[PDB]
Structure 1
Amino acid sequence: DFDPVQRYKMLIPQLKESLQTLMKVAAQNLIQNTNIDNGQKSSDGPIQRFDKCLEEFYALCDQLELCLRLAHECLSQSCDSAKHSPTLVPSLPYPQYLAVIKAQISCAKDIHTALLDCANKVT
């Protein structure tokens, strides 16, 4: 029952903090190998392999993108429906709505057939 936009809003801080933790563990691994290769036995602290954090970041990014795309598709559909269909949600009955929809579908198919015949005659 969660709305998309509010979920995105509440999830932005998650992506922020995950990127922060990602950079942190990256710096940890960097200083670890930098003290290992040329320094001495000082960095003895097993941190995260930096794989899980990156994968989680990518997954959260992908989920946010999915939610945004879904919201955009829904609003675009609502907009085009409102713009190319009157308000009839029972001053017209539902069968009239279905009939109008079918008639428009048939008109679009007829237009498509006419254009195909024009292309055929062109060739």
Structure 2
Amino acid sequence: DFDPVQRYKMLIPQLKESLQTLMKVAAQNLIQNTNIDNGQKSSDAPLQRFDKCLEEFYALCDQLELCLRLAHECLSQSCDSAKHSPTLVPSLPYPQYLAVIKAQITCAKDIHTALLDCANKVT
């Protein structure tokens, strides 16, 4: 069971080192390409794919972005729950909390319908 902060902390150094490695291999591919094209063939060695490098870099970047976004969403959820409901859970009777949530939803829907009828009357 890994945590968002833990996964972020373990992914950041992997991301940095992957960036370093991909930049090194890109520079190697570039100098090899120039030596074979501009000058004479001197780098008699096979280079790397060079596609997997930045591909996995972008993959880890997307992973980090989405997990940090999930953590932000969780914090926002907690904040909005604490603002729209008191901190009470098994203390508060669960059916009463469900009824209160249903009434809150109905009240919000009523306010929205009132504003919509208002806008329509403005039309």
Aligned to 1:49: 49
Q: Provide Cα deviations, 1:55-90, integer angstroms capped at 9, x if missing partner.
A: 010000000001000000011101110122112213
**Partners in 2 of 1:91 and 1:49 — Cα distance?**
59
Structure 2 counterparts to residues 56-71 of structure 1, below 5 A = 56-71=56-71
**Partners in 2 of 1:107 and 1:38 — Cα distance?**
74
Q: How much does 1:36 deviate?
A: 0.7
Are 1:82 and 2:73 counterparts?
no
Give the TM-score of the pair, scaled to structure 2: 0.95
Aligned to 1:105: 105
C-alpha RMSD of the superposition:
1.0
- Count of matched residue positions in the alignment of Structure 1 and Structure 2: 123
**Partners in 2 of 1:6 and 1:91 — Cα distance?**
31
- 4+ residue stretches of structure 1 with deviation over 3 A? none
Question: Does the 8 Å contact 1:88/1:94 carry over to 2?
Answer: no
| Percentage of matched positions with identical amino acids | 98
Structure 1 pair 56–100 and aligned structure 2 pair: CA distance change class (3 A): same
Q: Provide Cα deviations, 1:5-35, integer angstroms capped at 9, x if missing partner.
A: 1110111000000000011001101110111
Secondary structure of the structure 2 residue equivalent to 1:89: coil
**Partners in 1 of 2:30 and 2:5 — Cα distance?**
37
Question: Unaligned stretches of 5+ in structure 2?
Answer: none
Aligned to 2:25: 25
Question: Unaligned stretches of 5+ in structure 1?
Answer: none
Q: How much does 1:110 deviate?
A: 0.4
**Partners in 2 of 1:39 and 1:17 — Cα distance?**
31
Give the TM-score of the pair, scaled to structure 1: 0.95
